[PDB]
Write an enzyme that holds these catalytic residues in place. Structure first.
Site, PDB file in Angstrom:
ATOM      1  CG  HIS A 129      -0.435   0.054   2.545  1.00 58.03           C
ATOM      2  ND1 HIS A 129       0.462   1.019   2.955  1.00 58.03           N
ATOM      3  CD2 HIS A 129      -0.682  -0.712   3.638  1.00 58.03           C
ATOM      4  CE1 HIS A 129       0.768   0.824   4.227  1.00 58.03           C
ATOM      5  NE2 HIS A 129       0.088  -0.219   4.666  1.00 58.03           N
TER       6      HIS A 129
ATOM      7  N   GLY B  85       3.470   6.180  10.528  1.00 60.26           N
ATOM      8  CA  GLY B  85       4.793   5.957   9.978  1.00 60.26           C
ATOM      9  C   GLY B  85       5.413   4.612  10.299  1.00 60.26           C
TER      10      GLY B  85
ATOM     11  CB  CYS C  59       3.253   0.874   7.427  1.00 63.17           C
ATOM     12  SG  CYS C  59       1.576   1.220   7.984  1.00 63.17           S
TER      13      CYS C  59
HETATM   14  O1  LIG Z   1       1.351   4.594   9.649  1.00 66.63           O
HETATM   15  C1  LIG Z   1       0.150   4.338   9.809  1.00 66.63           C
HETATM   16  C2  LIG Z   1      -0.253   3.752  11.137  1.00 66.63           C
HETATM   17  C3  LIG Z   1      -0.088   2.458  11.523  1.00 66.63           C
HETATM   18  C4  LIG Z   1      -0.532   2.046  12.847  1.00 66.63           C
HETATM   19  O2  LIG Z   1      -0.438   0.905  13.310  1.00 66.63           O
HETATM   20  N1  LIG Z   1      -1.124   3.057  13.612  1.00 66.63           N
HETATM   21  C5  LIG Z   1      -1.310   4.374  13.234  1.00 66.63           C
HETATM   22  O3  LIG Z   1      -1.837   5.208  13.963  1.00 66.63           O
HETATM   23  N2  LIG Z   1      -0.854   4.672  11.966  1.00 66.63           N
HETATM   24  N3  LIG Z   1      -0.783   4.410   8.836  1.00 66.63           N
HETATM   25  C6  LIG Z   1      -2.160   3.925   8.926  1.00 66.63           C
HETATM   26  C7  LIG Z   1      -2.369   2.856   7.865  1.00 66.63           C
HETATM   27  N4  LIG Z   1      -2.063   3.410   6.531  1.00 66.63           N
HETATM   28  C8  LIG Z   1      -2.641   2.806   5.415  1.00 66.63           C
HETATM   29  C9  LIG Z   1      -2.414   3.282   4.111  1.00 66.63           C
HETATM   30  C10 LIG Z   1      -3.016   2.670   3.020  1.00 66.63           C
HETATM   31  C11 LIG Z   1      -3.866   1.571   3.170  1.00 66.63           C
HETATM   32  C12 LIG Z   1      -4.499   0.938   1.968  1.00 66.63           C
HETATM   33  F1  LIG Z   1      -4.218  -0.385   1.851  1.00 66.63           F
HETATM   34  F2  LIG Z   1      -5.851   1.032   2.008  1.00 66.63           F
HETATM   35  F3  LIG Z   1      -4.104   1.538   0.819  1.00 66.63           F
HETATM   36  C13 LIG Z   1      -4.092   1.108   4.474  1.00 66.63           C
HETATM   37 CL1  LIG Z   1      -5.145  -0.278   4.765  1.00 66.63          CL
HETATM   38  C14 LIG Z   1      -3.504   1.700   5.578  1.00 66.63           C
HETATM   39  C15 LIG Z   1      -0.728   4.001   6.407  1.00 66.63           C
HETATM   40  C16 LIG Z   1      -0.468   4.999   7.528  1.00 66.63           C
END
Ligand SMILES: O=C(c1cc(=O)[nH]c(=O)[nH]1)N1CCN(c2ccc(C(F)(F)F)c(Cl)c2)CC1
Ligand SMILES: O=C(c1cc(=O)[nH]c(=O)[nH]1)N1CCN(c2ccc(C(F)(F)F)c(Cl)c2)CC1
EC number: 3.4.19.12
Lengths: 306, 306
Positions: free
Chosen positions: A41, A143, A145
């Protein structure tokens, strides 16, 4: 003596963490040999999150769309591919700090260490269990991930988890290193929720043995029980049923303490039906289920690594 | 018109099946490029099954301990390694019939085709679902280990299952192609049992839509319901809860029939509470849960492959 939430030493993993930027999105990657692994993602923008078509999104990218930094050194991306929910970025330089590693998928109830990272830089290490509902109760901020979970078997790092997202209840979901999600979750922004969690019974028993080893004995009693009578009570309190295989795993701890497993189950049965009555076990007022039998042996008998 | 338990055409997989013999034990292998994949318990004898130490057993083997036959042609084993519960045998010749493939791990509720094989020779093909307790209800006799499960996406074979063992209740357990077991099972002869199975609710709904498409309408009614009221009844009958994601997946089938998902849920609720009353649906007197929404669309609208 003593008992702590103990993680594995993280040195061998810290040297594999890199930063991956695609567009305006930056997260963490794992750099082993000449491949950088990261959540797919990273190639999504805001318009794509609701219903991403990852094959389309990836076909519209070129190698130069991916910025990879290991500290100061920028790594040249010479190829890219997708394996399930993980992106594999081929780079021109093989990581000279690559440890002996393998990719393993863990089962609910097993524990591992998490190296939480931001911008490719390690921030902290902690221990957690894979819950029976295939989430982990982690500690992650924006951040994080691409942070990885791992165990160390002798000289070998077993990677078992890559972090992808936080669910609405505040628990965390991700994949193994082949890109296959733990649990029925998908990497798109929809309304997904974790199922019902249960308590990991074999882990509670291991923790009670750790308590006895460290001098906490007030919960013991003279009685004994059978698996079926115990499992009849356990299911009433949302505890996982206990198997004969669990009894065998606990063998080394019954041997060291001279307390039979089914003897210990009778104590657990009483604690479930009567509560703690304001007393503590190993400094806790709740029954802890995030130590495996192996974790207890490792900490209460001694095993180190390279 | 019509509705059948339909499997994928197996031609692309039949050409990858080989026979693997180690000692007096023979089972099936999957030959892709210059690698033959097979269950690692092929290296076990009778004395080893209770508590195999696979690292020890493999270190005492050499390449010439492994006999690999593709029909008449014997394949020369030039290397061997272990990946989790799967043995990887490097051979001197790359399979010229290797199709475009990938290794995918499936979720409970998804279906796939099984090519049952004996002595490397395909015997039959059938369709099954991964159950919520991570077993499959297959049809396997002695010698079937190493048989594979697969789906076909356009030109690409997605391998998702390799057969390892039959459990005491007569159901079957195996791994993905990276050697990671589905479910909490291990490849040793101990007393392991599958957990409680449930009915795959989204699949039953898809099957009811298939019935309407084929002229079975007697179970429909005027009422409607909510997810929470339906899930309240479903859990009472050991049915998986229904999610909004499930509702979205069923979208194409509600569109084609003009019957809303929650409308169809109300019919299912009545069938759960009143039974069939001696009537049948698509030739069945029970509610079928081994057709996914995709299977129904594929069979009731039309999609082919190479
Ligand atoms: O870095 C964090 C984070 C992580 C965490 O554990 N807790 C917190 O507070 N933040 N993000 C949240 C998740 N995010 C994300 C982006 C794109 C998609 C998709 F697949 F749909 F494209 C998805 Cl499913 C999630 C990236 C940023
Ligand atoms: O071929 C069949 C078969 C399969 C089937 O589905 N149904 C049926 O009736 N027979 N075998 C039964 C399983 N078996 C086996 C060997 C070794 C081990 C281990 F890991 F402990 F070493 C295990 Cl766990 C299983 C090989 C032979």
């Amino acid at each position: 003596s003593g008992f702590r939430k103990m993680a594995f030493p993280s040195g061998k993993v810290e040297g594999c963490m890199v930063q991956v930027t695609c567009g305006t999105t930056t997260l963490n990657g794992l750099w082993l040999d000449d491949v950088v692994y990261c959540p797919r993602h990273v190639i999504c923008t805001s318009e794509d999150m609701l219903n991403p078509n990852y094959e389309d999104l990836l076909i519209r990218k070129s190698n130069h769309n991916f910025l990879v930094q290991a500290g100061n050194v920028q790594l040249r991306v010479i190829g890219h591919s997708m394996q399930n929910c993980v992106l594999k970025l081929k780079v021109d330089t093989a990581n000279p700090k690559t440890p002996k590693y393998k990719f393993v998928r863990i089962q609910p109830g097993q524990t591992f260490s998490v190296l939480a990272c931001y911008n490719g830089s390690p921030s902290g290490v902690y221990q957690c269990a894979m819950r029976p509902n295939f989430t982990i109760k982690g500690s992650f901020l924006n951040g994080s991930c691409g942070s990885v979970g791992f165990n160390i078997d002798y000289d070998c790092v077993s990677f078992c988890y890559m972090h992808h997202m936080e669910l609405p209840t505040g628990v965390h979901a991700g994949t193994d290193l082949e890109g296959n999600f733990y649990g029925p979750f998908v990497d798109r922004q929809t309304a997904q929720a974790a199922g019902t969690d249960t308590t990991i019974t074999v882990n509670v028993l291991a923790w009670l043995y750790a308590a006895v080893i460290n001098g906490d004995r007030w919960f013991l009693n003279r009685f004994t029980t059978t698996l079926n009578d115990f499992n009849l009570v356990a299911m009433k309190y949302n505890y996982e049923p206990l198997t004969q295989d669990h009894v065998d795993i606990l063998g080394p701890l019954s041997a060291q303490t001279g307390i039979a497993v089914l003897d210990m189950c009778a104590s657990l049965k009483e604690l479930l039906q009567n509560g703690m009555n304001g007393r503590t076990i190993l400094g806790s007022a709740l029954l802890e289920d995030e130590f495996t039998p192996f974790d207890v042996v490792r900490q209460c008998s001694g095993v180190t690594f390279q």
